[PDB]
Amino acid sequence: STTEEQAKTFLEKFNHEAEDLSYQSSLASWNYNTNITDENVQKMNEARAKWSAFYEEQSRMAKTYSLEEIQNLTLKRQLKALQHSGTSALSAEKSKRLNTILNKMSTIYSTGKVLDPNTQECLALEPGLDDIMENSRDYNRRLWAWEGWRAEVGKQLRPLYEEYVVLENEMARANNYEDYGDYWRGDYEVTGAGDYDYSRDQLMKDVERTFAEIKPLYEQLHAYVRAKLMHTYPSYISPTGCLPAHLLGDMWGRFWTNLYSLTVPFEHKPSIDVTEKMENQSWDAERIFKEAEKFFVSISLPYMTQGFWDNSMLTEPGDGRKVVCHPTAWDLGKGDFRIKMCTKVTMDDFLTAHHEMGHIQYDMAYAAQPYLLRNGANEGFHEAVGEIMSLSAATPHYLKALGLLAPDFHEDNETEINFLLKQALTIVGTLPFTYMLEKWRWMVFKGEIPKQQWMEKWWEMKREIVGVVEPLPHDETYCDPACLFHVAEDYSFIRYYTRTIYQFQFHEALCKTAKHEGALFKCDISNSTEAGQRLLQMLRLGKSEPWTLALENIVGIKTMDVKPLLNYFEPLFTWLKEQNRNSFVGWSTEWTPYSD
Amino acid sequence: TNLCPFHEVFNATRFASVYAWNRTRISNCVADYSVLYNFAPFFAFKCYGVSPTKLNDLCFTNVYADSFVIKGNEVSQIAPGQTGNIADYNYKLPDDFTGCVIAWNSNKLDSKHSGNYDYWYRLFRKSKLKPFERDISTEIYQAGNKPCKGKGPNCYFPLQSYGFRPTYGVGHQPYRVVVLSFELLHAPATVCGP
Ligand SMILES: *[C@@H]1O[C@H](CO)[C@@H](O)[C@H](O)[C@H]1NC(C)=O
Ligand SMILES: *[C@@H]1O[C@H](CO)[C@@H](O)[C@H](O)[C@H]1NC(C)=O
Ligand SMILES: *[C@@H]1O[C@H](CO)[C@@H](O)[C@H](O)[C@H]1NC(C)=O
Ligand SMILES: *[C@@H]1O[C@H](CO)[C@@H](O)[C@H](O)[C@H]1NC(C)=O
Ligand SMILES: *[C@@H]1O[C@H](CO)[C@@H](O)[C@H](O)[C@H]1NC(C)=O
Ligand SMILES: *[C@@H]1O[C@H](CO)[C@@H](O)[C@H](O)[C@H]1NC(C)=O
Ligand SMILES: [Cl-]
Ligand SMILES: [Zn+2]
């Protein structure tokens, strides 16, 4: 007679029918991932159409349930997830305009080709630009290429982005959000939980506090970046001014991983390389995944069920059938989980295998929970839980223990220095850029900046925060940062930040439970089943109760903190603070490479 | 020495789901129990009122075998004094039940690529069940105080579908569960063991 029971019954249904439809859709998605033939394309175009139709119909039916007469928090959040109408809140004309422009970005970004002044060489974003950047060191090629790609991709996608902003602001205002920024902020919203409630701007204040606690680290590491690059290239980089944009190691400054070859401190020490020992013992995909299983058994997590080994593709299926194998694993459910990732005999594959196994363990952990809660407590848990396993497996103590590194070996000083540099430049390089794209999308949807100085303000505070300067001045007729993948296809970016900070929080908590002594980057979670149970205490939780309670279940702190970031790189930062005694710290915003 | 159709109850091809408790009656049989041991590796063999090995020395009046299909969790759910969507709306086992439960997996046999969609179960009835009750109650279920023709606004259909496929991992691979019900009541005992 009361609305609570009616909502519970509707949830029962949504659970069962959504399970059936989603299993169908995701199984056919796997059929894509392996067999990309034209017919199966159709098959789950109809399957995804069916899944979307069921989702829309169920949401429309659920809209009759009021949230003011419901008390059970699980039911609260299930209903709230149901009631996010999204694009359906707008008119049909606006919805079709939105989705057709979405398709237009998809096509343009997937097909953006740049002709060199000799038009012979037709080149794309992938793998052409990736090769050009991460392989060549020439200034002129990098500048010409990236400037041309920007200058043509923007010219097509600028007014499209403007109308995206307009229509997304309209949609957010329709859904009782002040701005589309609040729409992306709504994921961390938790209400009705005493000592655990969190607003939309509280995370903004948290991130600003993280700036206040992190700045000197990134200013300082930027100082070495410019110093080493001017040692390599003296006439192109000022010693006090900011680093120019087209010298950050990758396509858009996101990762500084390719700066290794130019920024290795001691190039004569050998880096940790076990691949040779892979062909020494002739390791294979079955063996590497079995090693991952031995690892995850040593942390008391449950095994891989027979369906895993039986049905998932584990090595490339010859040349007759083409497979796109970006390391991925989605939730079929009912125990039926599976992975495709092309296994080569390397360490990057080992790290990605451990990452995907973290994914799988997390995904099975909440298998018993209902459908609307079978996800990470926030969007940033899954990838962080995946990556902590990779970081744990990356230490040489594990390699010695499993026999993949020669036991007659001792931790070498300048080699582990390079090792810390490896995991440093692959992480901290992403932080300011991800922060900063996210802040600009916040202010874009907020409307604090008008249409006519987007790029100007972008690049000026790019100079003052990240220390990045345009090597070509660009006017308001540009939309350069739109050229990235995720911005081009409407995903958030705090997922990367939450991943990055949460993974170090979890690693700190686990190594504290692991009773590991000494250097913290040498910590391993192995034969530590108490730590495994500690982790599982959060792993089983999913989305049922607020993510901060789950975070406390590992660390005991209701908010994200920078202390693992500071502590992880401490001896590293001592070495560097003793190294900057003869170099400038900080950057000047006035200098640009074409201001002579 | 007339053997009892344990083979023909354990080797069928369409064991009716929980929603048709498919109960077979046992009388004038000899209860060979080596077939109850060698048949299939099994997954659940919890006995409550009868010892699982000191049972051949007993003679019973009647035995009732019910024959369903459930998922992994419901197999452990079937027990005296339990709660959930299968222990309260489709099949309820009395607290004073004395017997054994049998549950062994069947996928190759009952799942099917593309899938099964015949085993149908129930989710919402007006009230609670009584032990050993069949209720095929094809009655568009209602609530919301606007009883309706049904299948619509808060109008639900009692049954549901078991999406069964040959790749589901253990936890919901279609298990085949049959429950053996005895009674130790004074009567002409007809089912004796050798
Ligand atoms: C494999 O690809 C072929 C295309 O020749 C397709 O017919 C078949 O359905 C695919 N199988 C699976 C399991 O996806
Ligand atoms: C709230 O939902 C949970 C999960 O279904 C259930 O265990 C609990 O009894 C519910 N609480 C109330 C008051 O109905
Ligand atoms: C491993 O490499 C090869 C065998 O693949 C051989 O030289 C020897 O067994 C091992 N050691 C070294 C140094 O190569
Ligand atoms: C965990 O214990 C096993 C048991 O022998 C051992 O082989 C392995 O090296 C241990 N791992 C460690 C100590 O990291
Ligand atoms: C680093 O370790 C090496 C061990 O080979 C040692 O000789 C050296 O003194 C240590 N410290 C420095 C600053 O190299
Ligand atoms: C069912 O009967 C057939 C013959 O009718 C037999 O071959 C099969 O083995 C039996 N099933 C089992 C599980 O033994
Ligand atoms: Cl940039
Ligand atoms: Zn991934």
From TrEMBL, chain A:
Instruction: State the UniProt keywords alphabetically.
Output: Carboxypeptidase, Cell membrane, Cell projection, Chloride, Cytoplasm, Disulfide bond, Glycoprotein, Hydrolase, Membrane, Metal-binding, Metalloprotease, Phosphoprotein, Protease, Secreted, Signal, Transmembrane, Transmembrane helix, Zinc
Chemical reaction(s) catalysed? angiotensin I + H2O = angiotensin-(1-9) + L-leucine; angiotensin II + H2O = angiotensin-(1-7) + L-phenylalanine
Q: Its GO biological process terms?
A: proteolysis
GO molecular function terms noted in the UniProt entry? carboxypeptidase activity; metal ion binding; metallopeptidase activity; peptidyl-dipeptidase activity
* List of residues binding Zn(2+) 2: H355, H359, E383
Q: Provide the gene name from the record.
A: ACE2
**What does the record give as the active site?**
E356, H486
Q: Outline what the protein does.
A: Essential counter-regulatory carboxypeptidase of the renin-angiotensin hormone system that is a critical regulator of blood volume, systemic vascular resistance, and thus cardiovascular homeostasis. Converts angiotensin I to angiotensin 1-9, a nine-amino acid peptide with anti-hypertrophic effects in cardiomyocytes, and angiotensin II to angiotensin 1-7, which then acts as a beneficial vasodilator and anti-proliferation agent, counterbalancing the actions of the vasoconstrictor angiotensin II.
All disulfide bonds of the chain are: C325-C342, C511-C523
What is the E.C. number?
A: 3.4.-.-
Per UniProt, the cofactor note for this protein states: Binds 1 zinc ion per subunit.
Q: List localization entries.
A: Apical cell membrane; Cell membrane; Cell projection, Cilium; Cytoplasm
Record-listed chloride binding positions: Y188, R495
Primary site of residence: membrane
Organism for this UniProt entry: Bos taurus
Annotated residues that bind Zn(2+) 1 are located at: H355, H359, E383
Q: What is this protein called?
A: Angiotensin-converting enzyme
Residues where Zn(2+) binds: P327, E356
Names of required cofactors: chloride; Zn(2+)
Q: Which residues of the full protein are shown?
A: 19 to 614 of 804
Question: What's its membrane topology?
Answer: Single-pass type I membrane protein
- Can you list the GO cellular component terms from the UniProt entry? apical plasma membrane; cilium; cytoplasm; extracellular region
* Sequence similarity: Belongs to the peptidase M2 family.
Residues carrying covalently attached carbohydrate according to the record = N35, N72, N118, N280, N413, N527
